[PDB]
Amino acid sequence: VNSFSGYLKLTDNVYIKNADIVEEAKKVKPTVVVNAANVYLKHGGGVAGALNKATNNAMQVESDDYIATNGPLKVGGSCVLSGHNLAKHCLHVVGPNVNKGEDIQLLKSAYENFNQHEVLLAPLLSAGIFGADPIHSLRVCVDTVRTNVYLAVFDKNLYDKLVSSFL
Numbered sequence: 001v002n003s004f005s006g007y008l009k010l011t012d013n014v015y016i017k018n019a020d021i022v023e024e025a026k027k028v029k030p031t032v033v034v035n036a037a038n039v040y041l042k043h044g045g046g047v048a049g050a051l052n053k054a055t056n057n058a059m060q061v062e063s064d065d066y067i068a069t070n071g072p073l074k075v076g077g078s079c080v081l082s083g084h085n086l087a088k089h090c091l092h093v094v095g096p097n098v099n100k101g102e103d104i105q106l107l108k109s110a111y112e113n114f115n116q117h118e119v120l121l122a123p124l125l126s127a128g129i130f131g132a133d134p135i136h137s138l139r140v141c142v143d144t145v146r147t148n149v150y151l152a153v154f155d156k157n158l159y160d161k162l163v164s165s166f167l
């Protein structure tokens, strides 16, 4: 048993809810919250900015020190940092950004990072301002992630569309 509530079960291991991932993280305090990061860990908008804002910029301070030491991530890659006041850990995962011209085939590599964690709270990688088709991102998630993933979909209209089209 775990603490996630009101999710719709899609498969053996994938669950989904219409929820603000920030509000969800604050309530559940999951072991792992996934950030939809970029390779620079510059948390400007979307899930990265919202999460970072909820940490009072501590996520961005930590991230700047990580980049100063290690250099940028790879598209498709990840790193584990603090979850601050939101979670034990934050898994910063870089999905391809279609609005920057990155290869959508890297989305499967991005979701493979989730398999290193038994349970995660996550957004739909490469959806929203990342420019990929969220229906596609949900299908890659289901077909790639084998660990237990709780997907928060911010937009109510998108949530309804994802559920109604899910095979």
Ligand SMILES: O=C(O)COc1cccc2ccccc12
Pocket: 036, 046, 047, 123, 124, 125, 126, 127, 128, 129, 130, 134, 152, 153, 154, 155, 158
């Ligand atoms: O939750 C959703 O309605 C769809 O996902 C997203 C919405 C807006 C911004 C996003 C940025 C990164 C990844 C997903 C995002």
